[PDB]
Design an enzyme around this catalytic site. Structure first.
Site, mmCIF file in Angstrom:
data_model
loop_
_atom_site.group_PDB
_atom_site.id
_atom_site.type_symbol
_atom_site.label_atom_id
_atom_site.label_comp_id
_atom_site.label_asym_id
_atom_site.label_seq_id
_atom_site.Cartn_x
_atom_site.Cartn_y
_atom_site.Cartn_z
ATOM 1 C CG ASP B 345 -1.427 1.264 1.691
ATOM 2 O OD1 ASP B 345 -1.303 1.541 2.905
ATOM 3 O OD2 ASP B 345 -1.980 2.037 0.879
ATOM 4 C CG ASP B 686 -1.416 2.585 6.596
ATOM 5 O OD1 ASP B 686 -0.930 3.695 6.865
ATOM 6 O OD2 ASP B 686 -2.238 2.430 5.665
ATOM 7 C CG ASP B 690 -3.912 -1.675 3.097
ATOM 8 O OD1 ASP B 690 -4.021 -1.470 1.868
ATOM 9 O OD2 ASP B 690 -3.380 -0.859 3.879
#
Ligand SMILES: C[C@@H]1O[C@@H](O[C@H]2C[C@@H](O)[C@]3(CO)[C@H]4[C@H](O)C[C@]5(C)[C@@H](C6=CC(=O)OC6)CC[C@]5(O)[C@@H]4CC[C@]3(O)C2)[C@H](O)[C@H](O)[C@H]1O
Ligand SMILES: CC(C)CCC[C@@H](C)[C@H]1CC[C@H]2[C@@H]3CC=C4C[C@@H](O)CC[C@]4(C)[C@H]3CC[C@]12C
Ligand SMILES: CC(=O)N[C@@H]1[C@@H](O)[C@H](O)[C@@H](CO)O[C@H]1O
Ligand SMILES: CC(=O)N[C@@H]1[C@@H](O)[C@H](O)[C@@H](CO)O[C@H]1O
Ligand SMILES: CC(=O)N[C@@H]1[C@@H](O)[C@H](O)[C@@H](CO)O[C@H]1O
Ligand SMILES: [K+]
Ligand SMILES: [K+]
Ligand SMILES: [K+]
Ligand SMILES: [Mg+2]
Lengths: 265, 992, 38
Positions: B345, B686, B690
């Site tokens: 990410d 985070d 995700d």
């Protein structure tokens, strides 16, 4: 799993496991070099002698039927397997045997543990000395012997204090005393020995070991139980005495037996 | 099942408000009836997420209780009870011999159960983290009056009101809204507030302004909307179910172990039975040849190996905790080292999640500020009189403030009240110009026009600190084009200057370049007001321009971006050298994605997307050959239209991939796509978007600080300090321990051989039993333990970051090269060392080796109490037995002596012990303590009955010595070969 | 002579003493090395 390379494996081990057997043997053969032919490097593991007998005791027991002949063909086998050894036909010529004191005498040193002299000579022992002992079909006969130890002089206790078989025809000097016991006194003990006594004659010691004394003969002590009890398991403990003799709570054979006789019929 | 959830959502923001009520039997102004609300409740169910089918506590422990050797050990225990049963019935042998023997075997598993119930634990609280995001209460309108209700009682149809501060209670259709902004980080991973209005704004439901989503929070304003979706049927409700209900699956290390257990079993049963048929050919019944087959279990089954692998895993994890890197699973220690592709990410993972000032344009020159956390870069400029005029506007034409009470914490980390861009400017000036408050005090604000939607600019008027003036300064900022449309002059190096079309283009250059860096750009200008028209007490009008807003002095440009974390670019570089593919996977917009891609090295200099080429070449994209493009950047809106095969190819065909504007399900797909290829994939992220990806990765890594709780629940590892460079460390550890585990398998298995051979030769040679059941357990659960464990502190024999990831299919943890080495060779030298001590003890007590053949029947005959030795002496049962058990004891010790060697040679697979040295203090500790244990078992009084271990004469200690040294030399010899001839033979036959 | 009784003795007690002593020392030494840093 390969191909046209297995020859690189087979040939490898052939002369690697080769090299290793070769080294392993290499080290046995060096070790072997550094030992006497006549005497082991350690003897603290036979340290005090054990007492063993002729009747091959199933599990320290000899239960058998009197009203049956083959109810005890077994024990008789081991008896004769042992007794056939003490033949007077066997003991032939002044060599390698010696006629010894018909009465218990002293130790007989025969030099050193060398082969500087030929076979150290061995005392004779007539199985006839075991008067009375098919054996006892009733009230059996049991033969006792002292486990051979090279250079072991068995030493009878000297008469000073109290002693079980209190001074009874005590041959203090030259006999290693064997008494059989079980309270619970329902037996009839008798002892056929050398000169008549119930012990081992010091004139057979020290044992010199097989390589220096093949065809040597250790003493015996017949023990007949012509008891006045019948058809029950009787627990009797034959035991030897002496300075050099000790017993153990685990080694129930360390200088003593434990027999479970049962003349069931 | 879960495949439907992998598809994107389908909606009704396109419907009119009226149509929507129509469709939900609801009133726009009164809302549902109390009656129809309750009816619609029992219809659809609660506004609540439905918890996943958990796996109970009992079955978690019991599935480990058959962990390979486990079952086999039951077969022993149960068959050692085939001994105590036939014994304690027919032939009552009064002892704890085979009872207590049988016992140990089984309870070896029970207490061990906690080691693989330590290796395969699972912190699965995804759904509970999701459930936290539904508020406890909601504000609805029913029968025209508003009331708060248990949020579960919310149903499709009714009227909901939300205001700044509260959480979106369900998926809503905005029908009414006033100045309403919302936080959609749960969907996008981007936190900058988004407007909600009743007018549909994009055909895309996740993009339109008239839908507000559950699992998001109204940040400011007020709004009212109609509930379109409740509980599990909300956009993120589906994400929860998807994330919660995924099938975890087997890790690499787990699969490596399972595969080792098969090889292990494979030889345990080949020899096990091979010594049933051989025992039979030698005169043994189906009562004897059978008891030996089951016999040959222990010897082949390493009882201590589970415990070792676990303490090793555990000990490694502890080190990583000491590097601010939390591991929730033992198996997760390794995966980072077998990882071929990382899907990262962007926001708050690769980047700091914090609009930072990146570049400035003034003095006809581009500047670059330091954007790092700890500001590791350098100073750009301080000399310019321009700089300060700029600095002045940045601090003054600015309404952001540092939250109360933070002088302790560093500037860039302290929380600010205000929009991102204004916080950026604040933090910039505070950093490289001292206190902003200082400026805002020295130059009191008298009036200002707050940034309008229409003005596209914000100005202020200030009393000038300068006493020689104390007159009025005008400061403004906003859209760079709009700030230039209001300028006459340009503060160049201190002095103003006509805005020649020459500069009107050097600016236009700067603006387009910075804009291309994917950076947000602001224009800055001021005006020293003509004192004549503006008295000391002159009044200003922020309602109607009581003052000039045209022909002002342009001062500069400032560009800001959510910049990379400091060590991220390098961390990315290191992974790529490790032959790991790094793919960005972001919910963010493509311009921004791509810019960071380049910035952290995911896309390398010179690489191109088809679109880059077409632009450079000024041709259509239809005319660009796709294979000329090594890089790509795929929008989620495009990804949506692609078949999995089409993704597979994108994956096959590119080295530098950026998936941008991806939904949570899309991040999952990519991962699945990646795995489909065969790769081991680490997701690093985070946010709650995700979650499905982290939960699908072979290893999910989450950010400790910034990480949402959902990401944290879904992960296998937490980076407690948000230090991405830890990822590199993790892979390096996972690589190190994979190796050092082999070494520990090798070391343990080797002693198998000297433990087996004795019982075989016992049967084959008819000699007295050289080693006993009890003796073996002291090696396996005693002396080999600390040595085995201690191999985990071994280092690299080379730069393991320099090598490619292992092929998980081809490069096994336990291969044939290790069995031939532990068994065929080293263990074999070990057996002879043991057998030698054997022959020594007996030979020295009067039983020469030649006479030992064929004796065991007399020897073990309990009724013979006059076995004749080689010298003629006679031995009772217990007497000779004490000698044998002394042999058991010195054989035991032989192993230790030769495990000394095995320890030093298993220390390395390639290097010389002269190259690797002996710095491993845990290993050395192993030798001392191991030897101390053996000496103990030998010489401690009581251990001659509790363990049948007897005292050894000092000479006994050195029997194995020549065999221990030969091992050292043999192996040191062989690896000396290995190194010299890398290519072929010794390496392909014996290299682990 | 006929009083050779050392030929069947071994000081196992002293062995067991020196064995345990050595074990204790090796044991300690191991610590000293391990705890070189903790
Ligand atoms: C020929 C045989 O010898 C005697 O017994 C032998 C077989 C069997 O009885 C046992 C006890 O059960 C075996 C057992 O089976 C297999 C073992 C578990 C084996 C292992 C393999 C492995 O993988 O780990 C350890 C090695 C020794 C072992 O620990 C014991 C050792 C004592 C012994 O007693 C020895 C008896 O005299 C018997 O009557 C006679 O048939
Ligand atoms: C007690 C005595 C007979 C034991 C001797 C066992 C010998 C013959 C066995 C035990 C271990 C075995 C080796 C260990 C593993 C391998 C690797 C494999 O890919 C090919 C065979 C090979 C090289 C084996 C050959 C045979 C072997 C050396
Ligand atoms: C080898 C040998 O001499 N064996 C004899 C055996 O024949 C005989 O039964 C026994 C008693 O006379 O004495 C012994
Ligand atoms: C086994 C066997 O044949 N034994 C005989 C035995 O009966 C006899 O007493 C002996 C005479 O010395 O000869 C022999
Ligand atoms: C108790 C016993 O059986 N004693 C006998 C004895 O009666 C017999 O006179 C002698 C003959 O040799 O053998 C002995
Ligand atoms: K084992
Ligand atoms: K996972
Ligand atoms: K082992
Ligand atoms: Mg993020």
């Amino acid at each position: 799993r390969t191909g046209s390379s297995w020859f690189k494996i087979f040939l490898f081990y052939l002369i690697f496991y080769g090299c290793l057997a070769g080294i392993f043997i290499g080290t046995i053969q060096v070790l072997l070099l550094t030992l006497s032919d006549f005497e082991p490097k350690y003897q603290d593991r036979v340290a005090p002698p054990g007492l063993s007998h002729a009747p091959y005791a199933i599990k320290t027991e000899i239960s058998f039927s009197i009203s049956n002949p083959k109810s005890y063909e077994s024990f008789v086998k081991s008896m004769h397997k042992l007794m056939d050894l003490y033949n007077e036909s066997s003991q032939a010529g002044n060599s390698p045997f010696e006629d010894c004191s018909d009465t218990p005498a002293d130790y007989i040193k025969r030099g050193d543990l060398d082969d500087s002299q030929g076979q150290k000579k061995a005392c004779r022992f007539s199985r006839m000395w075991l008067k009375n002992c098919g054996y006892a079909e009733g009230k059996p006969c049991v033969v006792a012997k002292l486990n051979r130890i090279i250079g072991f002089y068995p030493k009878p206790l000297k008469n000073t204090t109290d002693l079980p078989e209190q001074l009874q025809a005590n041959y203090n000097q030259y006999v290693l005393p064997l008494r059989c016991a079980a309270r619970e006194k329902i037996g009839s003990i008798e002892y056929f020995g050398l000169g008549g006594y119930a012990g081992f004659p010091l004139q057979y010691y020290p044992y010199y070991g097989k390589r220096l004394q093949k065809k040597y003969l250790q003493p015996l002590l017949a023990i007949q139980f012509t008891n006045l009890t019948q058809n029950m398991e009787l627990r009797i403990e034959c035991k030897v005495y002496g300075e050099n003799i000790d017993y153990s709570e685990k080694d129930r054979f360390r200088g003593r037996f434990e027999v479970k006789i049962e003349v069931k019929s | 099942l879960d495949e439907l959830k992998k598809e994107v959502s389908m909606d009704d923001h396109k419907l009119s408000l009226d149509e929507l009520h129509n469709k939900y039997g609801t009133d726009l102004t009164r809302g549902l009836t109390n009656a129809r609300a309750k009816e619609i409740l029992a219809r659809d169910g609660p506004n609540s997420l439905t918890p996943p089918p958990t796996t109970p506590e009992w079955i978690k422990f019991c599935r480990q209780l058959f962990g390979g050797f486990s079952i086999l050990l039951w077969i022993g225990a149960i068959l050692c009870f085939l001994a105590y049963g036939i014994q304690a019935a027919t032939e009552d042998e009064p002892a704890n011999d085979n009872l207590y023997l049988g016992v140990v075997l089984s309870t070896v598993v029970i207490v061990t159960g906690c080691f693989s119930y330590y290796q395969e634990a699972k912190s699965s609280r995804i759904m509970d983290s999701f459930k936290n995001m539904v508020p406890q209460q909601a504000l609805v309108i029913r029968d025209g009056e508003k009331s708060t209700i248990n949020a579960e009682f919310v149903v499709a149809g009714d009227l909901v009101e939300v205001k700044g501060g509260d959480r979106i209670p369900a998926d809503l259709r905005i029908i009414s809204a006033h100045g309403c902004k919302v936080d959609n980080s749960s969907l996008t991973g981007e936190s900058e507030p988004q407007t909600r209005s009743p007018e549909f704004s994009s055909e895309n439901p996740l993009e339109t302004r008239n839908i507000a989503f559950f699992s998001t929070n109204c940040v400011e304003g007020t709004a009212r909307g109609v509930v379109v979706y409740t509980g599990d049927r909300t956009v993120m409700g589906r994400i929860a179910t998807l994330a919660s209900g995924l099938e975890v699956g087997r890790t690499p290390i787990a699969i490596e172990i399972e595969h080792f257990i098969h090889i292990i079993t494979g030889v345990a049963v080949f020899l096990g039975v091979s010594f049933f048929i051989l025992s039979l050919i030698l005169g043994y019944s189906w009562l004897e040849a059978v008891i030996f087959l089951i016999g040959i279990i222990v010897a082949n089954v390493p009882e201590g190996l589970l415990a070792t692998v676990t303490v090793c895993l555990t000990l490694t994890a502890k080190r990583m905790a000491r590097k601010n890197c939390l591991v929730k699973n033992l198996e997760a220690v390794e995966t980072l080292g077998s990882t071929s592709t990382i899907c990262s990410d962007k926001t708050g993972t690769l980047t700091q999640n914090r609009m930072t000032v990146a570049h400035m344009w003034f003095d006809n020159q581009i500047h670059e500020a330091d954007t790092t956390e700890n500001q590791s870069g350098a100073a750009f400029d301080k000399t310019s009189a321009t700089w300060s005029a700029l600095s002045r506007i940045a601090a003054l034409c600015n309404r952001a403030v540092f939250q109360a009470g933070q002088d302790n914490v560093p500037i860039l980390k302290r929380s600010v009240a205000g929009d991102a861009s204004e916080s950026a400017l604040l933090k910039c000036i505070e950093l490289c110009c001292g206190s902003v408050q200082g400026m805002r005090d020295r130059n009191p604000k008298i009036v200002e026009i707050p940034f309008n939607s229409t003005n596209k600019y914000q100005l202020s008027i200030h009393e000038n600190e300068k006493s020689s003036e104390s007159r009025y300064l005008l400061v403004m900022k906003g859209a760079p084009e709009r700030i230039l449309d209001r300028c006459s002059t340009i503060l160049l190096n201190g002095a103003e200057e006509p805005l020649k079309e020459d500069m009107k283009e050097a600016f236009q250059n700067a603006y387009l370049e910075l804009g291309g860096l994917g950076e947000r750009v602001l224009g800055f200008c001021h005006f020293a007001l003509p004192e004549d028209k503006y008295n000391e007490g002159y009044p200003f009008d922020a309602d109607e321009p009581n003052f000039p807003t045209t022909d002002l002095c342009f001062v500069g440009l400032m560009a800001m971006i959510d910049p990379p974390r400091a060590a991220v670019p390098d961390a990315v570089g290191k992974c790529r050298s490790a032959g790991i593919k790094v793919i960005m996977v972001t919910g963010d917009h493509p311009i921004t994605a791509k810019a960071i891609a380049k910035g952290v090295g995911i896309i390398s200099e010179g690489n191109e997307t088809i679109e880059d080429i077409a632009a450079r070449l000024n041709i259509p994209i239809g005319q660009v050959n796709p294979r000329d493009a090594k890089a790509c950047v795929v929008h989620g809106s495009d990804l949506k239209d692609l078949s999995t095969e089409v993704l597979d190819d994108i994956l096959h065909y590119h080295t530098e991939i950026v998936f941008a504007r991806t939904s949570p399900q899309q991040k999952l797909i990519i991962v699945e796509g990646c795995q489909r290829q065969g790769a081991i994939v680490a997701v690093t992220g985070d946010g709650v978007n995700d979650s499905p990806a982290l939960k699908k990765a072979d290893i999910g890594v989450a950010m400790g600080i910034s990480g949402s709780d959902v990401s944290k629940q879904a992960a296998d590892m937490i980076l407690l300090d948000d230090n991405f460079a830890s990822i590199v460390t993790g892979v390096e550890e996972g690589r190190l321990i994979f190796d050092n585990l082999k070494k520990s398998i090798a070391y343990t298995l080797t002693s198998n051989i000297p433990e087996i051979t004795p019982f075989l030769v016992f049967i084959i040679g008819n000699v007295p039993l050289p080693l006993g059941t009890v003796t073996i357990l002291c090696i396996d659960l005693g002396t080999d333990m600390v040595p085995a464990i201690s191999l985990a502190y071994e280092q690299a024999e080379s730069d393991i970051m320099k090598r490619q990831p292992r092929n998980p299919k081809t490069d096994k943890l336990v291969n044939e090269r290790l069995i031939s080495m532990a068994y065929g060779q080293i263990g074999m030298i070990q057996a002879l060392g043991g057998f030698f001590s054997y022959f020594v003890i007996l030979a020295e007590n009067g039983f020469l080796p030649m006479d030992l053949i064929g004796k065991r029947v007399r020897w073990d005959d309990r009724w013979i109490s006059d076995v004749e030795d080689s010298f003629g002496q006679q031995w009772t049962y217990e007497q000779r037995k004490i000698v044998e058990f002394t042999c058991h004891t010195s054989f035991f010790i032989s192993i230790v002596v030769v495990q000394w060697a095995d320890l030093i040679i298993c220390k390395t697979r390639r290097n010389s012990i002269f190259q690797q040295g002996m710095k491993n203090k845990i290993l050395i500790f192993g030798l001392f303590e191991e030897t101390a244990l053996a000496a103990f078992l030998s010489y401690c009084p009581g251990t001659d009955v509790a363990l049948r271990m007897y005292p050894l004469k000092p000479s006994w200690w050195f029997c194995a010595f020549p065999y221990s040294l030969i091992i050292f030399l043999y192996d040191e010899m062989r690896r000396f070969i290995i190194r010299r001839s890398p290519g072929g033979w010794v390496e392909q036959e014996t290299y682990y | 002579g006929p009083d050779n009784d050392e030929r069947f003795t071994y000081d196992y007690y002293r062995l067991r003493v020196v064995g345990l002593i050595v074990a204790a020392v090796l044991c300690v030494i191991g610590i000293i090395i391990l705890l070189a840093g903790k």
